[PDB]
Design a binder for these strands. Structure first.
Lengths: 117, 45, 158, 103
DNA sequence: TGGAGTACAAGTGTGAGGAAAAGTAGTTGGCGGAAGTAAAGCAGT
DNA sequence: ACTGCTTTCGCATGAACCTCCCAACTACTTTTCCTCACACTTGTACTCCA
């Protein structure tokens, strides 16, 4: 009766903080946290060698807007969110391609387990 | 734009308009601050 | 009135009133919750518990024309088809349609079998439809003079 | 076409308070009607309508032009103005057609 | 003769105001007991 | 004991609904447009007042 899913995310109702009612293991699980290397982007502050390791490179506005704020270890956890925000940008805007062999032709360097998940 | 606001209503955010305090430092004019919404949340639920 | 007051090559006026009460005669409940713009009821809408003003004007204008053209059975069958079970004004004109029949049928131009017991229906219809007009809400008729018009129709009968 | 572009094409309200003059000023500012075209208002064909408009004697056609010729830049050439400048509507009565009426 | 200044008129910075077609919402109406003849094991005193 | 109550039976074959969600009729927001007035400041004119 429950398979055919809900639109509501996996929340935390008994939590009192808004960053606590959205748990970090809901959107991205605790196994996929260590399949991403974190020093490939923060060590090189560059205009091309930071945009090179993004899943969906584009000439847009919001993509390179929140990236150029700071190089601080506080946003180290939220650095993989932007890496996973841009990977979800490729899925929703494509409705005619129904395979993975043509998914490379719109992207450049997609992730390994984050794409198949 | 209203196709986007309807997605947040399942979450439960009270998507309301901006203020004149939230008008000067955001690049939008002070008179046309009605079509420009700001979505916050409430901490118990 | 520009059609009725014209009378040169008029559409008789009454046909336009029939047009209004064909497509604007609604039976919707008046919802009263929505703020109303551009329609305001007492002369242009036709909801339940308010017979529209063009509806009752179609009744009186097609009764005065019905008298000036001396078809009375057409309107008396036409008014027969809606029971407006709320108001009193359409009952009075449905009373008054028979009272005009009892006026015209009671001439008899003698100087006598079916023409007597025909009129005694129409005398009975007026005494009931005026009674059911009084059963409904406020529509103050002269219910004394109209009885005194039926008695004069029986003095023509005797 | 969108709901705003199909509402800008039907001209719901006619040009008022010199709205039509200020659009020529924008038009003479984006493209240079000056320095390419003869921005010379045929002011002789203007006043002949204004003579026959209110049935005045034709002496006033040449009573007017000597007033125009006395108070003018280089005698002739009521030149049509251009505004490439800004969203500021020149209150100088810079419009050449507007100047002939005041004369 | 001189300078004060106060006006007048010019020039630059900045968002608020009037408009319409689509859409939304907002609320109702409205639809899909006069049947026989016969057996049986089960009850009653 | 004969009680009651069962119960099985039967002329061929042919034909013999309830919420609910969509509809009409209104209004009120929506999603971008073009069109200027206003607030100052430098400037040029004014007539001084000893």
């Amino acid at each position: 009766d429950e398979i055919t899913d809900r639109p509501t995310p996996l929340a935390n109702i008994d939590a009192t903080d808004v960053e606590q009612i959205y748990p970090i293991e809901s959107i991205i699980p605790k196994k996929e946290l260590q399949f991403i290397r974190v020093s490939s982007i923060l060590k090189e502050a560059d205009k091309e060698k930071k945009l090179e390791l993004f899943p969906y490179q584009n000439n847009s506005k919001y993509v390179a807007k929140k990236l150029d704020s700071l190089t601080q270890p506080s946003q180290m956890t939220k650095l993989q969110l932007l890496y996973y925000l841009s990977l979800l940008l490729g899925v929703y805007e494509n409705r005619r391609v129904n395979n993975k062999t043509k998914l490379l032709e719109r992207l450049n360097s997609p992730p390994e387990i984050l794409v198949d998940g | 734009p209203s196709k986007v606001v309807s997605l947040f209503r399942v979450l439960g955010a009270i998507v309301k308009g901006a203020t004149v305090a939230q008008a000067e430092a955001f690049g939008i004019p002070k008179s046309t601050a009605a079509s420009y919404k700001i979505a916050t949340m409430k901490v118990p639920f | 009135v520009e059609i009725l007051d014209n009378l040169s090559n008029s559409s008789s006026g009454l046909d336009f009133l029939q047009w209004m009460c064909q497509i604007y005669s609604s039976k919707s409940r008046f919802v009263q919750n929505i703020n109303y713009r551009s329609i305001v009821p007492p002369f242009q809408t036709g909801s339940r518990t308010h017979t529209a003003k063009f509806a009752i004007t179609y009744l009186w204008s097609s009764l005065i024309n019905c008298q000036k053209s001396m078809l009375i059975d057409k309107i008396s069958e036409w008014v027969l088809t809606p029971p407006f079970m709320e108001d009193a004004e359409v009952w009075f004109i449905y009373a008054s349609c028979h009272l005009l029949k009892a006026d015209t049928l009671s001439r008899q131009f003698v100087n006598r079998d079916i023409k007597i017991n025909q009129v005694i229906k129409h005398i009975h219809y007026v005494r009931t439809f005026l009674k059911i007009c009084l059963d409904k809400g406020g529509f103050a008729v002269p219910s004394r003079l109209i009885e005194n018009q039926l008695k004069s129709f029986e003095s023509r009968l005797y | 076409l969108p709901n705003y572009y199909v509402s800008i094409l039907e001209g719901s309200i006619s040009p008022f308070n010199g709205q039509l003059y200020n659009k020529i000023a924008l038009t003479c500012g984006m493209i240079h009607f000056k320095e390419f075209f003869n921005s010379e208002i045929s002011c002789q064909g203007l006043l002949l309508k204004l003579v026959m408009q209110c049935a005045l004697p034709p002496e006033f056609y040449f009573y007017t032009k000597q007033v125009i010729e006395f108070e003018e830049t280089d005698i002739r050439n009521l030149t049509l103005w251009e505004r490439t400048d800004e969203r500021h509507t020149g209150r100088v009565s810079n419009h050449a057609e507007l100047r002939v009426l005041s004369y």
